[PDB]
Amino acid sequence: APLNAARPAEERAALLAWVKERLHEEYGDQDPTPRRDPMHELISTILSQRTTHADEEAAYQELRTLGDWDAITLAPTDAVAHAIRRSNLPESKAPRIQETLRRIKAAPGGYDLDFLRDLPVKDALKWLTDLPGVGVKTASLVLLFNYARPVFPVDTHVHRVSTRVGVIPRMGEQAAHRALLALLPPDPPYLYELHINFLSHGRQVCTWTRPKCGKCILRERCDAYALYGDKVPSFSE
Ligand code: SF4
Ligand SMILES: [Mg+2]
Ligand SMILES: [Mg+2]
């Protein structure tokens, strides 16, 4: 009996579409994501590096008390750093934010990313990942959620469930963005449902430590259960 992770890409894509159908029945069109507007999502991410959810939201809203975006680009970095002080090491985050805002204003349009809509996917991605503090996961999130482009953001929840099941072998999170997208159709609503359903399943069942495999709708095709049964270890390295 071969593990899922060693199976051909075509077999692993059939597996992932089965996974998506099962998660759709457990969770439907349920959405545990922030669903923010583009500028909010981008800046939030920068503030949300080595930082809890409650502290990032607090850091974002106090940031926005400095003024609108144009005011934050011009506010002295001392003021920006003190406002976001409840996030991860505000000294480093404050310049990345200012520079990101600066580079967005210079783009065609106001503090808005209307051009990412009708741009080649690879090019839209590369433009966001060139912004300081923005990685492929945040760029994929903004492109999928706000502009309905066919990209698939892979957060820790998505990465953990998909790896444990064996839809992909173990690899870095950035490499997993290309690997899973390669198994998926260019169908933005499909990708967004798949994403939010992974978040629900990772938060509720396939948890970082002690997953609840006995309540898991995927257990019968899960590599991790096949290997460890009731003793699936914490998602490591
Ligand atoms: S069987 Fe366990 S490890 Fe596998 S997907 Fe379900 S909860 Fe995660
Ligand atoms: Mg602009
Ligand atoms: Mg970057």
Numbering used by the authors: 19 to 255
Q: Could you share sentences copied from the article?
A:
Endonuclease III (EndoIII) is a ubiquitous bifunctional DNA glycosylase belonging to the helix-hairpin-helix (HhH)-GDP superfamily of DNA glycosylases. It is active for a broad range of oxidized pyrimidine lesions, removing numerous forms of modified thymine and cytosine bases from DNA, such as thymine glycol (Tg), a major stable oxidative modification of thymine, via the Base Excision Repair (BER) pathway. The crystal structures of EndoIIIs from E. coli (EcEndoIII) D. radiodurans (DrEndoIII1 and DrEndoIII3) and G. stearothermophilus (GsEndoIII) revealed that these enzymes comprise two domains divided by a positively charged DNA binding cleft containing the HhH motif and the catalytic residues Asp and Lys. D. radiodurans possesses three genes encoding EndoIII-like enzymes (DrEndoIII1, DrEndoIII2 and DrEndoIII3), while other bacteria typically possess one.
DrEndoIII1 displays a lower activity towards the common substrates and act mostly as a monofunctional DNA glycosylase. In DrEndoIII1 we substituted Arg61 and Tyr100 in DIL1 and DIL2 with the equivalent residues found in DrEndoIII2 (Glu and Leu). DrEndoIII1 Y100L shows more compromised activity when compared with wild-type and DrEndoIII1 R61Q. Our results demonstrate that the affinity of the DrEndoIII1 mutants for the substrates (with THF:G mispair and C:G pair) is reduced when compared with the wild-type enzyme. In the Y100L mutant it may be caused by a reduced steric fit of the Gln to the opposite strand of the flipped-out base compared to Tyr. MutY also possesses a Tyr residue in the same position as DrEndoIII1, thus it is possible that this residue in some HhH DNA glycosylases is optimized for stabilization of the substrate upon DNA binding. The crystal structures were determined and refined to resolutions of 1.38, 1.95 and 1.89 Å for DrEndoIII1 R61Q, DrEndoIII1 Y100L and DrEndoIII3 G250T/N251H, respectively. Additionally, the DrEndoIII1 R61Q and Y100L crystal structures include two magnesium ions, and the DrEndoIII3 G250T/N251H crystal structure has two chloride ions.
